[PDB]
Design a protein around this ligand. Sequence first.
Ligand SMILES: Nc1ncnc2c1ncn2[C@@H]1O[C@H](COP(=O)(O)OP(=O)(O)O)[C@@H](O)[C@H]1O
Ligand SMILES: Nc1ncnc2c1ncn2[C@@H]1O[C@H](COP(=O)(O)OP(=O)(O)O)[C@@H](O)[C@H]1O
Ligand SMILES: Nc1ncnc2c1ncn2[C@@H]1O[C@H](COP(=O)(O)OP(=O)(O)O)[C@@H](O)[C@H]1O
Ligand SMILES: Nc1ncnc2c1ncn2[C@@H]1O[C@H](COP(=O)(O)OP(=O)(O)O)[C@@H](O)[C@H]1O
Lengths: 111, 559, 566
Amino acid sequence: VYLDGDRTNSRSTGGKCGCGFKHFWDGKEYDNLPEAFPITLEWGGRVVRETVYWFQYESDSSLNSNVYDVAMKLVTKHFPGEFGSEILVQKVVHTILHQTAKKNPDDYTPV
Amino acid sequence: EVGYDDIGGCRKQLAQIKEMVELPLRHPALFKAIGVKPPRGILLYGPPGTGKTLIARAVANETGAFFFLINGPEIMSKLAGESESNLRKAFEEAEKNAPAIIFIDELDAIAPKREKTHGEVERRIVSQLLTLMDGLKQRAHVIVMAATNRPNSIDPALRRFGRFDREVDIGIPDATGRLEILQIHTKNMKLADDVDLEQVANETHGHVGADLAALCSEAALQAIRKKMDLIDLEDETIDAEVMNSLAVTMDDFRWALSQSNPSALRETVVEVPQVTWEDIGGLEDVKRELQELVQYPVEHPDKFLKFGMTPSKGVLFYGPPGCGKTLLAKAIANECQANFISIKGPELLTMWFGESEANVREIFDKARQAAPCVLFFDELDSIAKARGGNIGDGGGAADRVINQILTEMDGMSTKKNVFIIGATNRPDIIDPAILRPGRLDQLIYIPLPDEKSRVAILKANLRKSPVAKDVDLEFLAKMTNGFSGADLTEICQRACKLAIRESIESEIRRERERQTDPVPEIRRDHFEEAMRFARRSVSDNDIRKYEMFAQTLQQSRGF
Amino acid sequence: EVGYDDIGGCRKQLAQIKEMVELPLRHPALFKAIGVKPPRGILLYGPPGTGKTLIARAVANETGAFFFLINGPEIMSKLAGESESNLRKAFEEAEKNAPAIIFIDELDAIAPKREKTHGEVERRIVSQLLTLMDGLKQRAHVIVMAATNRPNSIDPALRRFGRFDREVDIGIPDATGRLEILQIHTKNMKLADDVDLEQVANETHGHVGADLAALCSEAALQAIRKKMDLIDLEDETIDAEVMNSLAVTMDDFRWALSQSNPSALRETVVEVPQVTWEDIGGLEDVKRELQELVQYPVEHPDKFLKFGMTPSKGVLFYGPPGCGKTLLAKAIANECQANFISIKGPELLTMWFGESEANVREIFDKARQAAPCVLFFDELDSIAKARGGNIGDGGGAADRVINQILTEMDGMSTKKNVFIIGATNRPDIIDPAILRPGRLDQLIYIPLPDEKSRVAILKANLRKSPVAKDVDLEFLAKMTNGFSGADLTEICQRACKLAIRESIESEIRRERERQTDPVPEIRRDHFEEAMRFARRSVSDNDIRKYEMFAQTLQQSRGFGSFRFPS
Ligand SMILES: Nc1ncnc2c1ncn2[C@@H]1O[C@H](COP(=O)(O)OP(=O)(O)O)[C@@H](O)[C@H]1O
Ligand SMILES: Nc1ncnc2c1ncn2[C@@H]1O[C@H](COP(=O)(O)OP(=O)(O)O)[C@@H](O)[C@H]1O
Ligand SMILES: Nc1ncnc2c1ncn2[C@@H]1O[C@H](COP(=O)(O)OP(=O)(O)O)[C@@H](O)[C@H]1O
Ligand SMILES: Nc1ncnc2c1ncn2[C@@H]1O[C@H](COP(=O)(O)OP(=O)(O)O)[C@@H](O)[C@H]1O
């Protein structure tokens, strides 16, 4: 197995990083490396600090990150079962969308 | 003349009016000798066209009593002073021809609300009416009846004791009432074999007796016009047999109904639901609780008196959306044969935005009139959610509309059989004041349907549509697993839509070969195709929310 | 005298009046023998100038029944007691000469709203009118017709049965109606051979019959003024050798049209749109969905009731701005030949700011009266956007206007064919109560146009203006990749502006050189210069939101492998 970001014996078609191999992450293989973005949640008084990993420039269409899934997964992982948490989901979605905007399609800054 | 059999939908009201008026009129000597006060004033509510002059005329004719008619506008059109003379002469003549009934057609015209009337002549007329009504203690066996639209449109001085004390409310006809009205109005006409008045009676939702009479006249006239241009029988007179040679068809009724403007459409619907327990499977415990809470006090009052147990005021249903919270209320209302009044969330939001919370009182008054009744409030959390939510903006969960609901439910006697049911899918933000021992003490959880209930849901949804015998609903119910009622009904709707589209396409294609019923039922392939669009509305996180809420509620009680 | 030929514009309303009136009047004995009851009161709506009095007079003349006219202001101008005497005398005289038609000109003047009476003799007059109305015990055959501007400007006591219960709505004439009115009013005058009445009829957007008659008279007088000044002989009589020699030209009509005052411009316009599917390229799936949702129920009701399926009510369009959400609604309304009434975002904002949401009842009543109809709510999100948008004022997603829309939609009868379409570009901020099943269940995504769509847009925009045959629209569509439906229109307008500027400059230069057309068409140079200013309205960082939203909606339907055991 692999821990995180380790090289895997599988050549990456869209090897934008230049490594030439797919990298292991979260139980899957990605052509590139994810980009890290800090984020904070304040639901129910408690504050949780987390790093969102955003995937982009992936050859596989299904492998590209979707904001509505990332935010929902994060909210359900940190605040499971809280009533009316969809407001937090919308806030996280908006923050991620604003933060991940690329002015030039070349600012690849892998972690 | 008009008879008792001419009346249509209003049957209970006719019984009340008969029991109130027949005894003093048919036996004047019995009431004159005995020391019991007969009623002196009767007030009839209801929107215009429901039939109120008809009822009074029928009662007067059946009882064989003199009938004197007074029109509001007719009396108000006279000169100043002459109107009072007309009123006095009418009352004197009615007194002379004892027993007699005086009918005042437009009471709100003569005596409207106090602020509405400004001239002193109008107030003089109202005072003259009050004096004449109070002068009936001489007991010449004269009964005064009046008609209006709203209880509040009349001067409150006219509802005083000794003058228009009694009250009969005539509402919108139900399905059976509309069928009876149609049968009455179509007696003289001749129909065709394909015309069934029951179906059109079901379709006409917000019509009153006048609307149904207009509909019948329009259909008959359309048929006559459709036949006359072809027959072109424009002579000096009209033949007898030509009328009997033509009949009204179902297409004429459909066209007339499609070109009809109902009058009473915004009025609250107060009817007995047609939904039975078969429409929703499972939830036997909820059925038992509902029967115990709403059926026992209305059928065994002696038991409650003997044990001194105050009947429960109401319950609150909470659970994920679309699981059938309204169907349970409708079914329990139907099983007890009690009227059902539903107040949706948009009504509460309109009352909150416009600050017209006083209307809440009126609602309960209606529920007080049609007892026994089941009063249903849907989305009680809508007000709280609209002004914030879990966090909110200002103070607690109290507001205007909810406060008025509380102050009206608290001041409601248990002798009347009015039961209040509330529904909400966000029990967290509900006002704790409602959840009080004496207003809405019971909390009932309505979970997602189980395997045995989904089959019943599918059967209830599909009972209206043809289905091929090859369709195996058990496998579909097994495969759904985590669906709600709102999803199963969507699956059925998509299957029907696919079938309709295929039928239309096949019919269009088969017309292309004509220049030189392929699908009678719904096959299994339609369901297989429709299942590709099936979406699960309630996630697992929502189930976690509701289960944790129920577990927190339940863990308090342990013994 | 007046007849059906003298009336233009409205045709359905005249047909309804004929159906309601001709039979009971032309066949007195036949209707007396038959036990049905003819209507005894008709109420004509519509703004002033639409020709209600003309309609009543023409119906009375064509049928042949006696016509007695009651004028509101004339009745109300008499002394107290004398007015009632005149009213009763009019009614009894009309009854004597049966059959007869009684026309109350301005009913709102005689019996206004109850709260607007503020008097006693006015209420006495209203009561006298009610007594006379309810006193029509057959009286052979007398029909009472009244005219009012608005349904709300009449005492509700007159609306009940046995009174003015039947209503006919006379609206603003459409382009064909305006052409008919112009032809009616110009049939007596002489026009020059270059007068295209269709053009001027299409130009006049908001006009009633009175406005068009005034326009024709003004043009004729303009021609007379421009001609007679030459002869300048105002003789004893207007000689016949002047009117015949005088003709009205297109210039006079344009001059009169420029100096014209429309009467109805803020009135909601209800008509069948003139756009078709050819104006939008591609989007075949959306076309099929719209035909399935709004054309089948209005065309094959029997198959809908056979399977017991209730037709849906609403559809919500979402997507980037300017991609043709309004055009699709107009096209689908035109294809089914149904009326189309549009409600923009500023209307909702005015209702929200003014706290007057009772106008929603008026909108839905108009839609009901104009059935079958398509009711289009544009940018429903506007109110939600006006409350802070994503970062609101701390409140929930509910407002006094959208809630009123929900209330009206729930109470709307499904039997009548009224279809509601909503449009937005921010599906996230839409109130979830709208998307509840039974109100607005269908969500349709309108993406950026494709190659064929872009070609169709360019062809549709360039249809009106001349272009050179050397222009290659296919290559232009190839160059344009991420533009929306508005950027192409901007490009076309820039090309037209460049052509106009070149033409005017060349004309001025030629005229200044002349002391002792060069460009008839738009050529490649103008488009080349125009493309130097083209800008993408929607960036690549804004469509990703819609793409991800649609992907989440599509991915949740993970039940595509269901098969019966067989
Ligand atoms: N329940 C009913 N059964 C039979 N006819 C009815 C009924 N309701 C209304 N109608 C018809 O409607 C017509 C007008 O009713 P009306 O007495 O004017 O009502 P209102 O007094 O409330 O205005 C009557 O001629 C009557 O035949
Ligand atoms: N348990 C159920 N059984 C049968 N039908 C259902 C059920 N739940 C929802 N439906 C269908 O959904 C529609 C409305 O659902 P409703 O009962 O109003 O949801 P809720 O319980 O959230 O009020 C009805 O037309 C009904 O046919
Ligand atoms: N549909 C129409 N066709 C022809 N002429 C019209 C039409 N509508 C209005 N007019 C013209 O407008 C003039 C005034 O109309 P008028 O009878 O005053 O309408 P209203 O009484 O509703 O104000 C009439 O002389 C008539 O010639
Ligand atoms: N898909 C399209 N096809 C044709 N024309 C379009 C299209 N999209 C936009 N337009 C142009 O835009 C103008 C109106 O845009 P509109 O459809 O109101 O934008 P929106 O879709 O944001 O409502 C029309 O003049 C039309 O020519």
